[PDB]
Amino acid sequence: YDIQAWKKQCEELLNLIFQCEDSEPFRQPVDLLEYPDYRDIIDTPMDFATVRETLEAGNYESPMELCKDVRLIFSNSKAYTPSKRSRIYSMSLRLSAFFEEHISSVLSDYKSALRFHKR
Ligand SMILES: O=C(NCC1=[SH]CCC1)N1CCN(C(=O)c2ccco2)CC1
C-alpha cells in the first residue's frame, strides 16, 4: 500500500525502455530537417527523455500522468506514420505492448494504495 512506490517502478520501466532497441526513435525529439512537416501533424511532441526528466523533476503526481505522456509518444507515431507497416511505427507498436504489459501493475498498485489510504 506504498503510495510512492510507482515512481521507482516507473524509473525502472523507463530504464528497460531505454535498453530496448525499439525505443531508439522515441528517446529524443524529431529533427525538422529530417521530418519538416512533423509539427503540421503533431500538436504535442513527446519522447521518453522528456518523460524521464518530468519524472525525475518531481513533476508527475501519479503514474496515470506518466502513462498519458507515454501513450502520447505512441499516438504521435500512429498519427505521423504514412503506413501501418512503417519501420518506426512498427517499433512503436512493440514498445507500446511492452509498456502496457509492465505499467498495468504499477497503475493497479498505486490506485489500490490510494484507496487503502482513504479507506
Ligand atoms: O526522428 C524521429 N525520432 C528521432 C530519432 S529516430 C532514431 C533515433 C532518434 N522520429 C521520426 C518520426 N516519428 C514517428 O513516430 C514516425 C512514424 C513513422 C515515421 O516516423 C517519431 C520518431
Structure-determination technique: X-ray
Task: State the resolution, in angstroms.
Answer: 1.2
What atom of ligand 1 comes closest to residue 92's alpha carbon?
15
Specify the residue for cell string 513527446: 46
DSSP structure class, residue 57:
T
Q: Check if the beta carbon of residue 22 is closer than 8 Å to that of residue 97.
A: no
Q: Give 98 Cα–ligand 1 centroid separation in angstroms.
A: 18
Residue 107 and residue 25: Cα distance in Å, rounded? Answer: 26
Burial string for 40-79 (b: 16+ CB within 10 Å, else e) reads eebeeebbbebbbeebeeeebeebeebbebbebbbebbee
Q: Give 88 Cα–ligand 1 centroid separation in angstroms.
A: 6
- Indicate whether residue 89 lines ligand 1 (CB < 6 A): yes
Nearest one of 17, 35, 106, 101 to 64, comparing CA atoms? 106
